[PDB]
Design a protein around this ligand. Structure first.
Ligand SMILES: [Zn+2]
Length: 91
């Protein structure tokens, strides 16, 4: 409820500050989310790494390269995993 939202705000400030610190904070926010057993729209579900459990934004804990071919593609590397993720896009 409110508890997640406070953690989310805290996770956001740490997030640019240090990906690694944020990684610890997010893992707390996600752990809270399952424990509270509350589903939220896109806020945590769509804004995190698959195994880091860290806030996903390009430029901050993770970086994205945008490629132009006539197939759109972006590649995202998130530091906490240290791994590159592909996200296909069309139009
Ligand atoms: Zn990651």
């Amino acid at each position: 409820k409110e508890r997640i939202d406070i953690l989310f705000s805290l996770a956001e400030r740490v997030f640019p500050y240090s990906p690694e610190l944020a990684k610890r904070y997010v893992e707390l926010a996600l752990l809270v989310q399952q424990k509270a057993k509350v589903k939220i729209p896109r806020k945590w579900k769509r804004r995190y790494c698959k195994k880091c459990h860290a806030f996903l934004v390009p430029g901050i804990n993770a970086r994205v390269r945008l490629r132009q071919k006539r197939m759109p593609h972006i590649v995202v590397k998130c530091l906490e995993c240290g791994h590159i993720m592909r996200y296909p896009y069309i139009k």
